[PDB]
T-cell receptor, first 240, second 202 residues
Framework: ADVTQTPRNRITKTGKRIMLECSQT?????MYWYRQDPGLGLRLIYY???????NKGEISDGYSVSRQAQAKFSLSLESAIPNQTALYFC??????????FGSGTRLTVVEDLNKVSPPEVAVFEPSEAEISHTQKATLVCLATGFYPDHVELSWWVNGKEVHSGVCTDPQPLKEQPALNDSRYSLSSRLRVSATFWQNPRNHFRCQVQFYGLSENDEWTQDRAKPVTQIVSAEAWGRAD | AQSVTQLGSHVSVSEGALVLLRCNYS??????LFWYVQYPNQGLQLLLK??????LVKGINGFEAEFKKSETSFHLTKPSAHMSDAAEYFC??????????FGKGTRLHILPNIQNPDPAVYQLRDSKSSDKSVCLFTDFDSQTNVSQSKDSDVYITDKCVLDMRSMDFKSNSAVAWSNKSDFACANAFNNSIIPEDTFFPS
């Protein structure tokens, strides 16, 4: 109970068998797999009280499990389908509901790997009219044209990650909402004082970590293979 | 315990006001009850739980909840909402003597106290070019909300609150953009009800 799960992130095509693994060090009899989806909370898939005992939870269809040791509880998607896209959480419990959750597995099931695509990223510079009116300066990052919706955006000032002054959209929007495999777009803002933006020594970078294909995946297109990768964009401060 | 109900997938509270997130249970025998929090990007953290001891249970950070059998409730409260309380909260219940079952969850949105709003629409230019730009609607108070686009080639984000620690300063903003030829920032937020004194530079 350092509960650990693997993998942390995975993208897969439909029709594949996918395995998630939970391990614990405390040897608790009771282990559990849950899935989390927006608006639905954490729904129980399967759970186990010993190496000989498996019990269905509310959403066990499409999944199987194995309790191959006191320490280990494996989850399988038998034949992955897109609606199994979710954050998956394993947990253990003691005899009195003391639960320990693993840190999560973000899994995306896609129908067609040919649609995977890394983002293009651009930084938009603060407006002069903002600087004049407020003595503050807002940078905007735009990540566009990506698929699946499986990214992490962060901001980096003079080489270090910042949280203050940042807001990132909580979910990406669909570029073409009437398509089931629309590409996505995400924006973020970083606001600093005008004085800090005005210093040409200051360097600002938006970093987007994209999750896509692995070295193992086949790629038959001319365009770049859309592998997991970092895409950034940058601007320097400007005396003006 | 058969079930647990949280009402409202998204709820608001004024910065500085009492936080109250509601949870009710269905279980003839009193159950053990739990409130977990989830920060964006993260897993689950226990705030507090009822385990048939104290009826007023006190948790991390000023959180408390009172188990009320006669009204089958375990509402989570904190005396004053901070911007850092923005998170999703889950109430949970023991069931069948072998598991915890989860509520559907409620996201808490904290409306910053904006004493001096300065609503404005600004145009921002791409740092390379490729002479692209975006429009930034910013510095309106929480009586404004931003409506989604009704032109499919114009994209408009939800409002988003940033907290500049360097100046102890919070502000709302939404971003709009398009590749359309006749797109102008003057028109970008025409489908939203904006303040009558929105600044449009210049």
């Amino acid at each position: 109970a350092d509960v650990t799960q693997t993998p942390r992130n995975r993208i897969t095509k439909t029709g594949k068998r996918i395995m998630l693994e939970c391990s614990q060090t405390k040897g608790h009899d009771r282990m559990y797999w849950y899935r989390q989806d927006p608006g639905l909370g954490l729904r129980l898939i399967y759970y186990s009280f010993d190496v000989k005992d498996i019990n269905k939870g509310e959403i066990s269809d499409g999944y199987s499990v194995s309790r191959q040791a006191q320490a280990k509880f494996s989850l399988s998607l038998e034949s992955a389908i897109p609606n199994q896209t979710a954050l998956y959480f394993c947990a253990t419990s003691d005899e009195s509901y003391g639960y320990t959750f693993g840190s999560g597995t973000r899994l995306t099931v896609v129908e067609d790997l040919n649609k995977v695509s890394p983002p293009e990223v651009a930084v938009f510079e603060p407006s002069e009219a903002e600087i004049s009116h407020t003595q503050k300066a807002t940078l905007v990052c735009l990540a566009t044209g990506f698929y699946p919706d499986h990214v992490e955006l962060s901001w980096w000032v003079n080489g270090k990650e910042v949280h203050s002054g940042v807001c990132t959209d909580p979910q990406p929007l669909k570029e073409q909402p009437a398509l089931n495999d629309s590409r996505y777009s995400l924006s973020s803002r970083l606001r600093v004082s005008a004085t800090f933006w005005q210093n040409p020594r200051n360097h600002f970078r938006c970093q987007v970590q994209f999750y896509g294909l692995s070295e193992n995946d086949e790629w038959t297109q001319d365009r770049a293979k859309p592998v997991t990768q970092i895409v950034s964009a940058e601007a320097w401060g400007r005396a003006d | 315990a058969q079930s647990v109900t949280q009402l409202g997938s998204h709820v608001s509270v004024s910065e500085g006001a009492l936080v109250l997130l509601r949870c009710n249970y269905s279980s003839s025998v009193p159950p053990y009850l739990f409130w977990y929090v989830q920060y964006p990007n993260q897993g689950l953290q226990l705030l507090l739980k009822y385990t048939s001891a104290a009826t007023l249970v006190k948790g991390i950070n000023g959180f408390e909840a009172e188990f009320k059998k006669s009204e089958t409730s375990f509402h989570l409260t904190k005396p004053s909402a901070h911007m850092s309380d923005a998170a999703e909260y889950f109430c949970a219940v023991s069931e069948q003597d072998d598991k915890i079952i989860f509520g559907k969850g409620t996201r808490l949105h904290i409306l910053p106290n904006i004493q001096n709003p300065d609503p404005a629409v600004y145009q921002l230019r791409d740092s390379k070019s490729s002479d692209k730009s975006v429009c930034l609607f910013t510095d309106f108070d929480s009586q404004t909300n931003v409506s989604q686009s009704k032109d499919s080639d114009v994209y408009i984000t939800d409002k988003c609150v940033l907290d500049m620690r360097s100046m102890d300063f919070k502000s709302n903003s939404a971003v709009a953009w398009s590749n359309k030829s006749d797109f102008a920032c003057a028109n970008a937020f025409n489908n939203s009800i904006i303040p009558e004194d929105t600044f449009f530079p210049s």
